[PDB]
Each structure stands twice: as structure tokens, then as C-alpha cells.
Amino acid sequence: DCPSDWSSYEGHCYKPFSEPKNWADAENFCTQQHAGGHLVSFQSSEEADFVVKLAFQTFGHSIFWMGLSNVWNQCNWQWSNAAMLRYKAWAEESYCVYFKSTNNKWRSRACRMMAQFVCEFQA
Amino acid sequence: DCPSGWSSYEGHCYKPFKLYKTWDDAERFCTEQAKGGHLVSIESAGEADFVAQLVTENIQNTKSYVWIGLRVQGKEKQCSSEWSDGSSVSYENWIEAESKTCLGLEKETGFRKWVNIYCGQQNPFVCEA
Amino acid sequence: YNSGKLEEFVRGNLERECKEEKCSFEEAREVFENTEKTTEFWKQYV
Ligand SMILES: [Ca+2]
Ligand SMILES: [Ca+2]
Ligand SMILES: [Ca+2]
Ligand SMILES: [Ca+2]
Ligand SMILES: [Ca+2]
Ligand SMILES: [Ca+2]
Ligand SMILES: [Ca+2]
Ligand SMILES: [Ca+2]
Ligand SMILES: [Ca+2]
Ligand SMILES: [Ca+2]
């Protein structure tokens, strides 16, 4: 039986927060709300279905951080002419994953930006 | 030393196109405008300034981005990315347009900053040979 | 137009984001949640 402020599903506990934070802060905050806590992770479509609903029922339409960060930083970025990648002029340093409370689609947002979020931990 | 219509900068020729194409079609089109053609590769601040000026003088849209040749080669949605909980990512539900693995120059940042954008977008571009 | 605050917390809206403000491809797509519609909207937008 998850803490009074949380919701249970498949042996796990989930809880959506209204305090706006960038990705890193959100993840760190989750590790402080209960042992083994982290930003919500969607290992299956069923889990995502639960979380999206929980999130929308609680705060309605909004955007919530998911446990994925720096998603393209270590990708194989290459120039089409095969020139070596040295000089750089990125508008943003990194992108993180989040979801809009209306559906379980995965979306990207600059990690430095703000959003609400959902924490999770294994009971 | 460059074909009519193209501009020369430090040993290479550049040409801006106001055509709206996807990154794939743009890159391919460039490979056909000249031998060794490709979408522009911005390798120094000077070349970035040269390209920005070229774009400002031949695109002027106040909207839409301008393709550059840098993108993620593979076809993956996320690279070496693991859930913060420590588990591996297997299941995923990305909106294709949310996977911004291509880059474009934009007016708001003077055409000198690389903005992560969806590769399926249809934008103008600059070729380099 | 994204001011960079908490505005993206609210449901997209063509009028507020694309008519009263200048919008990007993705902001329009966030309203349509359909790519063809956005590309289309883009042709007649710019
Ligand atoms: Ca999980
Ligand atoms: Ca170059
Ligand atoms: Ca706005
Ligand atoms: Ca907006
Ligand atoms: Ca929006
Ligand atoms: Ca109005
Ligand atoms: Ca406004
Ligand atoms: Ca947005
Ligand atoms: Ca979006
Ligand atoms: Ca159409």
C-alpha cells in the first residue's frame, strides 16, 4: 500500500508533482521522496497508460518529465560530406523525454527547461 | 572558380536554395547540383558567418529553418540512453516528429545556431561543394 | 511563440500561439498532432 500521497500499480508506486523543475532537478527530487525513487520510467504501454491517466486526473492537461535524459548527446552525429565534427554551435546542449497528459506518446524538450513530473519506485 | 549562382569561401563553393524539401531530399538534391555536393558543413565560426550572410540575402522568411549537413547517422530514436532507474530501454513510443535528430539554422538566432529539428520537416537549404 | 516559462503546460492553440504570436512548425504540430496537417499549414503560413 503506497504512501497515502501515491498511487499503486503492478507492485510499483507513482506520484505526480506540481512543482516545476528542469530534468536533472526533477530526477534528484524523486530520489528524495522515497527510497529507490526516480523519474517515472515506461517499460510497457500498460504502465504508461496508468501514469498518463493518474497524471491527467490529478493535474489535468500538462507536461511531465520521464526518466530519460541526454537522449541524443552520444549519437553518431556526422556531416554528410564526412568532414570531422569539431567546431560546434548547438542552440541547446541536451534534450530530455516527457509526456503530455492527454496521451502516452513520447516527446522531447530541452533538459534545461521546466515541466511537472512523476516519481516512481519499486515497492 | 565557382559556377554562376554559387559563392566562393575558403576553397569551397556555396549555393542557397529557397526550395522546401526534407533533409533526405535536400541532401540528395545537393549531391546532384555539383560533383561532391552535399548540404553545407559548418566547420568554423568564419564559415558560419559566411553562410549566415548567404542565407539572409537569399532566403528571408522569418519562418522555416535552413538545413545544414549535420545529423544522426543511425536510425535509432535515442543513443546509449538508459532509464534513470538504471534499466535498459526496450519499449518506446516516440512520436517521429519529436525525434529531432536533424539541425537547421533559424532567423531568431541569426542563422548561426544549430537547432534540433525533425528531419521530415520541409525547409530551404544551402549546398556546399 | 515560446516565452520559455510555463506556457507549454497549456493546451496548444493556433490563435494564441500561431496567430497572435509567431509559431514554429512544432508548436503548430502540437495542436494538430498530425504531420501532414502541419506541413500543409506551413505552406500557407510561410
Ligand atoms: Ca517503470
Ligand atoms: Ca564546409
Ligand atoms: Ca506563446
Ligand atoms: Ca508555444
Ligand atoms: Ca505548444
Ligand atoms: Ca485573438
Ligand atoms: Ca501571447
Ligand atoms: Ca512546445
Ligand atoms: Ca512537441
Ligand atoms: Ca495534404
UniProtKB/Swiss-Prot annotation, chain A:
Q: Which domain of life is it from?
A: Eukaryota
Record flagged with keyword Metal-binding: yes
GO CC, sorted alphabetically, is:
extracellular region
Q: What else is known?
A: Calcium is required for ligand binding.
**Recorded GO MF terms:** calcium ion binding; toxin activity
Among its keywords, does the record have Secreted?
yes
Q: What does the UniProt function comment say about this protein?
A: When linked to subunit A of IX/X-bp, anticoagulant protein which binds to the gamma-carboxyglutamic acid-domain regions of factors IX (F9) and factor X (10) in the presence of calcium with a 1 to 1 stoichiometry.
- Keywords of this protein's UniProt record, alphabetized? Blood coagulation cascade inhibiting toxin, Calcium, Disulfide bond, Hemostasis impairing toxin, Metal-binding, Secreted, Signal, Toxin
Which positions fall inside the C-type lectin domain? Answer: 1-123
The family this protein is said to belong to: Belongs to the snaclec family.
Q: What is the lineage of its organism?
A: Eukaryota, Metazoa, Chordata, Craniata, Vertebrata
Q: What is this protein called?
A: Snaclec coagulation factor IX/factor X-binding protein subunit B
Describe its assembly: Heterodimer with subunit A of IX/X-bp or IX-bp; disulfide-linked.
Binding positions (Ca(2+)): 41, 43, 47, 120
Where is the protein situated, by its record's location annotation? Secreted
The disulfide bridges present are: 2-13, 30-119, 96-111
Tissue localization of expression is: Expressed by the venom gland.
Organism for this UniProt entry: Protobothrops flavoviridis
Curated annotation (Swiss-Prot), chain B:
Domain of life of the native organism: Eukaryota
What keywords would UniProt list here? Answer: Blood coagulation cascade inhibiting toxin, Calcium, Disulfide bond, Hemostasis impairing toxin, Metal-binding, Secreted, Signal, Toxin
GO CC terms on record?
Answer: extracellular region
Keyword field contains Transcription? no
Tell me which residues make up the C-type lectin domain.
Answer: 1-129
User: What is stated as this protein's family in its record?
Assistant: Belongs to the snaclec family.
Q: What protein name applies here?
A: Snaclec coagulation factor IX/factor X-binding protein subunit A
Organism, scientific name: Protobothrops flavoviridis
Of the parent protein, the shown chain spans 24 to 152 of 152
From Swiss-Prot, chain C:
Annotated binding of Ca(2+) 2, by residue: 2, 7-8, 17, 27
What are the disulfide bonds?
Answer: 18-23
Q: Which residues bind Ca(2+) 4?
A: 15, 20
Domain annotation Gla: ranges: 1-46
Q: Which residues carry this modification: 4-carboxyglutamate?
A: 7-8, 15, 17, 20-21, 26-27, 30, 33, 36, 40
Q: What is this protein called?
A: Coagulation factor IXa light chain
Positions annotated to bind Mg(2+) 1: 15, 20
| Chain residues that bind Ca(2+) 6 | 36, 40
Which of this chain's residues are annotated to bind Ca(2+) 1?
1, 7, 17, 21
On the tree of life, the source organism's domain of life is Eukaryota
Sites carrying sugar chains: 39
Organism listed in the record: Bos taurus
Residue numbers binding Mg(2+) 3: 36, 40
Q: Which residues of the full protein are shown?
A: 47 to 92 of 462
UniProt-annotated binding residues for Ca(2+) 5: 26, 30
* Binding residues for Ca(2+) 3: 8, 17, 27, 30
User: Which residues hold Mg(2+) 2?
Assistant: 26, 30
